[PDB]
Scaffold this motif. Structure first.
Motif, PDB file in Angstrom:
ATOM      1  N   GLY A   1       0.835  -1.175   0.000  1.00 55.09           N
ATOM      2  CA  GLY A   1       0.000   0.000   0.000  1.00 55.09           C
ATOM      3  C   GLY A   1       0.872   1.228   0.000  1.00 55.09           C
ATOM      4  N   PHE A   2       0.275   2.358  -0.359  1.00 53.27           N
ATOM      5  CA  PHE A   2       0.914   3.652  -0.231  1.00 53.27           C
ATOM      6  C   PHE A   2      -0.128   4.753  -0.336  1.00 53.27           C
ATOM      7  CE2 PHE A   2       2.718   7.495  -2.123  1.00 53.27           C
ATOM      8  CZ  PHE A   2       3.719   7.795  -1.210  1.00 53.27           C
ATOM      9  N   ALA A   3       0.091   5.825   0.407  1.00 50.30           N
ATOM     10  CA  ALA A   3      -0.655   7.051   0.230  1.00 50.30           C
ATOM     11  C   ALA A   3       0.280   8.178   0.608  1.00 50.30           C
ATOM     12  CB  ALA A   3      -1.879   7.060   1.109  1.00 50.30           C
TER      13      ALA A   3
ATOM     14  N   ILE B   1      -2.968  10.990   4.592  1.00 51.68           N
ATOM     15  CA  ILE B   1      -3.230  10.103   5.711  1.00 51.68           C
ATOM     16  C   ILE B   1      -2.804  10.824   6.993  1.00 51.68           C
ATOM     17  CG2 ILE B   1      -2.893   8.033   4.346  1.00 51.68           C
ATOM     18  CD1 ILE B   1      -0.169   7.809   5.103  1.00 51.68           C
TER      19      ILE B   1
ATOM     20  N   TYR C   1      -6.800   7.999   8.917  1.00 50.92           N
ATOM     21  CA  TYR C   1      -6.694   6.976   7.865  1.00 50.92           C
ATOM     22  C   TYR C   1      -7.204   7.511   6.508  1.00 50.92           C
ATOM     23  CZ  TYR C   1      -6.025   2.183   6.137  1.00 50.92           C
ATOM     24  OH  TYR C   1      -5.648   1.086   5.449  1.00 50.92           O
TER      25      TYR C   1
ATOM     26  N   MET D   1      -6.794   6.652   2.614  1.00 53.36           N
ATOM     27  CA  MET D   1      -6.419   5.245   2.604  1.00 53.36           C
ATOM     28  C   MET D   1      -7.639   4.369   2.879  1.00 53.36           C
ATOM     29  SD  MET D   1      -3.806   3.540   1.891  1.00 53.36           S
ATOM     30  CE  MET D   1      -3.123   1.894   2.067  1.00 53.36           C
TER      31      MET D   1
ATOM     32  N   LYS E   1      -8.984   1.216   0.611  1.00 49.92           N
ATOM     33  CA  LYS E   1      -9.161  -0.081   1.237  1.00 49.92           C
ATOM     34  C   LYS E   1     -10.567  -0.602   1.001  1.00 49.92           C
ATOM     35  CE  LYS E   1      -5.078  -0.919   3.192  1.00 49.92           C
ATOM     36  NZ  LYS E   1      -4.215  -2.045   2.792  1.00 49.92           N
TER      37      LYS E   1
ATOM     38  N   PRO F   1      -4.004  -2.947  14.101  1.00 50.72           N
ATOM     39  CA  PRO F   1      -2.781  -2.139  13.993  1.00 50.72           C
ATOM     40  C   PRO F   1      -1.507  -2.891  14.433  1.00 50.72           C
ATOM     41  CG  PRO F   1      -4.079  -1.510  15.907  1.00 50.72           C
ATOM     42  CD  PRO F   1      -4.955  -2.376  15.065  1.00 50.72           C
ATOM     43  N   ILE F   2      -0.455  -2.828  13.615  1.00 47.39           N
ATOM     44  CA  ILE F   2       0.855  -3.360  13.964  1.00 47.39           C
ATOM     45  C   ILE F   2       1.963  -2.367  13.613  1.00 47.39           C
ATOM     46  CG2 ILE F   2       2.460  -5.218  13.684  1.00 47.39           C
ATOM     47  CD1 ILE F   2       0.159  -6.888  12.514  1.00 47.39           C
TER      48      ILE F   2
ATOM     49  N   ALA G   1       5.288   1.260   7.449  1.00 40.52           N
ATOM     50  CA  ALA G   1       4.223   2.047   6.842  1.00 40.52           C
ATOM     51  C   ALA G   1       3.387   2.752   7.920  1.00 40.52           C
ATOM     52  CB  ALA G   1       3.363   1.175   5.965  1.00 40.52           C
ATOM     53  N   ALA G   2       3.392   2.190   9.126  1.00 39.49           N
ATOM     54  CA  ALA G   2       2.610   2.727  10.235  1.00 39.49           C
ATOM     55  C   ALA G   2       3.151   4.080  10.719  1.00 39.49           C
ATOM     56  CB  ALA G   2       2.564   1.730  11.384  1.00 39.49           C
TER      57      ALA G   2
ATOM     58  N   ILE H   1       1.138   7.234   9.775  1.00 40.49           N
ATOM     59  CA  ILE H   1      -0.125   7.415  10.461  1.00 40.49           C
ATOM     60  C   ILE H   1       0.145   8.286  11.684  1.00 40.49           C
ATOM     61  CG2 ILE H   1      -2.158   6.212  11.344  1.00 40.49           C
ATOM     62  CD1 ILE H   1      -1.829   5.262   8.776  1.00 40.49           C
TER      63      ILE H   1
ATOM     64  N   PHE I   1      -0.483   6.813  15.647  1.00 40.63           N
ATOM     65  CA  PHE I   1      -0.622   5.361  15.540  1.00 40.63           C
ATOM     66  C   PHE I   1      -0.611   4.817  16.929  1.00 40.63           C
ATOM     67  CE2 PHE I   1       1.345   1.207  15.557  1.00 40.63           C
ATOM     68  CZ  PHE I   1       0.615   0.526  14.607  1.00 40.63           C
TER      69      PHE I   1
ATOM     70  N   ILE J   1      -3.991   4.813  18.545  1.00 35.92           N
ATOM     71  CA  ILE J   1      -4.778   3.677  18.056  1.00 35.92           C
ATOM     72  C   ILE J   1      -4.336   2.378  18.736  1.00 35.92           C
ATOM     73  CG2 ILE J   1      -5.292   2.209  16.095  1.00 35.92           C
ATOM     74  CD1 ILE J   1      -4.962   4.746  14.330  1.00 35.92           C
TER      75      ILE J   1
END
Ligand SMILES: NC(=O)c1ccc[n+]([C@@H]2O[C@H](COP(=O)([O-])OP(=O)(O)OC[C@H]3O[C@@H](n4cnc5c(N)ncnc54)[C@H](O)[C@@H]3O)[C@@H](O)[C@H]2O)c1
Ligand SMILES: NC(=O)c1ccc[n+]([C@@H]2O[C@H](COP(=O)([O-])OP(=O)(O)OC[C@H]3O[C@@H](n4cnc5c(N)ncnc54)[C@H](O)[C@@H]3O)[C@@H](O)[C@H]2O)c1
Ligand SMILES: NC(=O)c1ccc[n+]([C@@H]2O[C@H](COP(=O)([O-])OP(=O)(O)OC[C@H]3O[C@@H](n4cnc5c(N)ncnc54)[C@H](O)[C@@H]3O)[C@@H](O)[C@H]2O)c1
Ligand SMILES: NC(=O)c1ccc[n+]([C@@H]2O[C@H](COP(=O)([O-])OP(=O)(O)OC[C@H]3O[C@@H](n4cnc5c(N)ncnc54)[C@H](O)[C@@H]3O)[C@@H](O)[C@H]2O)c1
Ligand SMILES: CCc1cc(O)c(Oc2cccnc2C)cc1F
Ligand SMILES: CCc1cc(O)c(Oc2cccnc2C)cc1F
Ligand SMILES: CCc1cc(O)c(Oc2cccnc2C)cc1F
Ligand SMILES: CCc1cc(O)c(Oc2cccnc2C)cc1F
Lengths: 257, 257, 257, 257
Positions: B92-94, B99, B155, B158, B162, B190-191, B195-196, B199, B202, B205
């Protein structure tokens, strides 16, 4: 009526069969003052007639593919209306191949890009461009289809965009709702309109739902129009981020068995 | 293991924290033979090491933004493997703005286009490009997030992509399922991965779900990896068009009250 | 296998066609130690044979309509097993009239009460009764059907109970998950089993899904069984409050058009 | 108004804070002719006053736990009205223990039976009992809550019944829709009413939704009432089997993060 004094911009009124035509009749009936958009110089005369029929002299060009026209739409609107209470987004497009036959066969990066650009991105783009003049009880409404929720023959790439569109309703509602602005969608059952031509075997879908919906009948643009007016009105002031099915209940059943 | 003899191409393995790293460990553990992709020449050395660790000499470049690389990925793969039994899409990417903060603020046609191009279109694009060599019990798997289903802070754009991605799972499943090919998604909780980073909050979250999920704990890439292996395996042979939550149950509650 | 050392109580094993028979085979195969329940003294001999076939001497009566038998089930189980790692709830019933023809016609307060009592309430009842001996990675699994999500011909009253059942999975998951206990359901596609007799035109449904599911094929108890094993196992340790479709993807499409 | 000439039976009007009080005001306002029910002889005087305020002399007893009273409700109604165009079901009950604290703790077969009997079964029961006199554009409306969709603190057993209730809307809609009768529900956001007393920390929920709903505000019985009127009216003639959120958009977000 329950839309007295509301000023509502409508898009996607292409013919008297259009879903937007239905929404316009219902709105005008309830006391609303309307304005309309069109795509290209060659449709200018038709929408001017249409607008006249709703007692309006307000038509504005807007190919939603073009940033300049979007920005200029509200630049123009601003010169006539002080603010906007309603925005109808009744717009979509997908290259014919992409909504015909097998999903993968009609898939290209370009088709995907276009369907999403025109059918999905345009709704929050117009919302962003409208924001400056939006009132505090303003209301945005878009049109979706069940193909977003479940896979439907031929709907293909359009299904994906409609999924994105419905998500955009939810993100829009959070982004605009602090300002008192509500955002909703109607997921309408199949209606024979011009855009419905590009759906292979629309007739089959139409027969299927008339046979299988709980009410055993297809929906009309009058029925969708009536629901739209409601959502656009202060009667729906507690309702935002909602995707409302107006499809004689078809979504809720497993038909054909 | 329950993946003996299965040949599985994995994408999106960027670090040992990656969700794809988790899926790879779980797959290798169950008897699978793996191959991997990477983006750009400057990551070639890292993924070659990673692949070595899973006992594989098969790494291939693929910026999914580029048709040529997609087509060449399977052209290359074809020279080593006769067919493919598994495809992991963990990509993924944004653009960061899109985001971060308010949904409308980070919205531009370009941001929208990019997020959808990379995060949504790429899954069925790879599927189309893989089709020639896919086996008859082959299995495709992508990664989604709850932000598709409901609006989640930051989010934003994104979330929309999704939504489109999850719809693509359903259309893909109908398009490929006659060939015996299954298509599914895991909607992971969430992990903390690379990429996180993009956000904002994060961490907020992450704390919220550890406090509010039914299991009162965050999910690990081992947990998601285990579920992925299952879906990729013949144990999930009755399962397609499914979006499976692996989020300690977080999706199913209204937390914080 | 991935269930080595797991001790799992199964209910609803009535014949070799039962969904619970499938789950048992898959579990035993993966290293699980099993126990079984039955209804009435007149089925005691059959389930004792069945249990023997899975290498088990543990059969216990339980009409879930009766509090005393539920409580005594785990009283008895306690004398053999120290704790329980898995509970399969593969039980349902509705008066024949209530799952035949028109929804309202087969509707009585009693039919309603009975279907819900047996098909819905029994799942969290057994969970409550099992709680004392449940381990810290234990896992509960029930069976649902798509009729909970959408209206399906003849499924009628049973559809309502299944809705309640699926909700129970969510509330159960919040109630038990702090103890590390996971709760999930499988929404299985139609399978010719004994209970399927009470469905008028089951054969019509069966043909419809074979013709319209994305995989174009019906699911077997082996396929459901395999998924159940997964959910019962530590592979699904990140998964709770989930209703997992194992129906060849049927739920995700609008078929017949 | 858009309910001129519609004859609508309302239940659940207990106080001026009741959701049914809101629906009544909105209906009366739109030209509807109303009738009301009550539970027990000791509430007869209050509802007679209430009915007077809506210009109605039509009050009828109905404890929906009792078959005889249900049957006699429409026996009585028949003597005044020829037919019925609207039925509002704004009724629920669960033993206090069952909607307080932990789900399993307040769980007994009796509590379960009662909550479902009163909150779920009663809706299609009244529909069956009303069927003889229902018109061909008649419309039934019940009230649900988000706790049906996702697990909410304290809502517990009531969540299960609401799930069954929403399923009943779908089965009802298929059963009655050939007669042209529409069935729908409103999933209302939290409103301080008498029944809300039995919810521990209702105040916490109320604050949470005011802080986290997209519109950042709680819904009023006027807002729900307005939506109900719509659904009851011919404006919603294309809408059945729908569960409509009127909750300021709360359902659609993940709040608190
Ligand atoms: N017809 C149906 O059965 C049906 C059912 C459910 C939803 N919908 C949705 O309803 C909405 C309205 O479509 P319709 O069915 O009323 O058909 P329609 O042909 O009458 O309207 C389509 C409109 O999209 C406009 N449009 C296309 N590309 C555009 C662009 N680049 N910029 C601005 N406008 C553009 C057209 O001008 C046209 O007016 C669409 O969003 C459609 O997806 C239609
Ligand atoms: N991290 C989470 O909390 C989480 C939760 C749910 C879902 N997801 C999803 O999981 C998937 C994997 O992401 P991740 O969390 O493991 O983080 P990650 O950073 O480890 O993986 C992202 C991958 O996307 C790849 N990528 C980006 N643009 C690409 C392009 N143009 N072509 C090819 N690859 C490209 C990157 O190379 C990277 O390997 C993503 O789809 C993500 O949306 C992540
Ligand atoms: N076959 C299908 O298509 C299908 C689809 C979805 C869900 N299900 C579900 O799977 C489970 C069983 O389905 P099946 O097709 O294998 O039918 P089945 O008849 O073979 O098994 C059901 C079991 O429940 C038992 N049972 C009935 N009343 C009971 C009571 N009071 N106490 C304890 N046990 C009782 C039956 O005796 C039997 O053992 C149920 O959860 C059912 O709802 C079946
Ligand atoms: N206030 C909320 O936040 C909320 C939210 C969602 C749904 N609801 C629902 O709206 C309706 C009522 O809510 P309320 O807050 O106005 O509470 P309320 O107490 O004011 O109204 C409920 C009505 O049901 C009646 N009732 C109880 N048992 C009955 C029986 N056996 N037969 C007939 N009537 C009986 C009550 O007496 C009362 O008239 C119910 O459907 C309830 O489930 C309320
Ligand atoms: C099949 C029902 C249906 C749904 C649409 O979104 C629709 O509008 C479309 C479809 C394809 C391309 N463009 C538009 C506006 C037309 C339809 F007939
Ligand atoms: C908040 C949970 C989460 C979801 C993702 O899809 C995710 O992956 C993203 C997010 C934004 C941009 N690009 C990717 C791959 C990372 C995450 F941390
Ligand atoms: C139509 C698919 C189906 C669903 C069930 O829950 C099922 O199990 C039932 C059905 C009705 C009553 N009781 C049980 C156990 C059987 C089935 F065939
Ligand atoms: C928390 C929101 C809420 C939901 C209801 O269904 C409600 O009505 C109930 C609740 C519990 C028992 N009975 C009724 C009528 C009251 C509420 F406050």
């Amino acid at each position: 009526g329950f839309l007295d004094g509301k000023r509502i911009l409508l898009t996607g009124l292409l013919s008297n069969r259009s879903i937007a035509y239905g929404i316009a009749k219902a709105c005008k009936r309830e006391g609303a003052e309307l304005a309309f958009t069109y795509v290209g110089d060659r449709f200018k005369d038709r929408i001017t007639e249409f607008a006249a029929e709703f007692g309006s002299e307000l038509v504005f060009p807007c190919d939603v593919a073009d940033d300049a026209q979007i920005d200029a739409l509200f630049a123009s609107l601003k010169t006539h209306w002080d603010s906007l209470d309603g925005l109808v987004h009744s717009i979509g497009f997908a290259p014919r191949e992409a909504i015909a036959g097998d999903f993968l066969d009609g898939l290209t990066r370009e088709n995907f890009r276009i369907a999403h650009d025109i059918s999905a991105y345009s709704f929050p783009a117009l919302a962003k461009a409208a924001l400056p003049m939006l009132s505090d009880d303003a209301s945005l409404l878009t049109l979706s289809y069940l193909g977003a929720e479940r896979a439907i023959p031929n709907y293909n790439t359009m299904g994906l965009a409609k999924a994105a569109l419905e998500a955009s309703v939810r993100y829009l509602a959070v982004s605009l709702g602090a300002k008192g602005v509500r955002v909703n969608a109607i997921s309408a059952g199949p209606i024979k309109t011009l855009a419905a031509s590009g759906i292979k075997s629309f007739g089959k879908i139409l027969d299927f739902v008339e046979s299988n919906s709980p009410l055993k009948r297809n929906v009309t643009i009058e029925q969708v129009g009536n629901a739209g007016a409601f959502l656009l009105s202060d009667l729906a002031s507690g309702v935002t981020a909602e995707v409302m099915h107006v499809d004689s209940g078809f979504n809720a059943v497993v038909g054909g068995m």
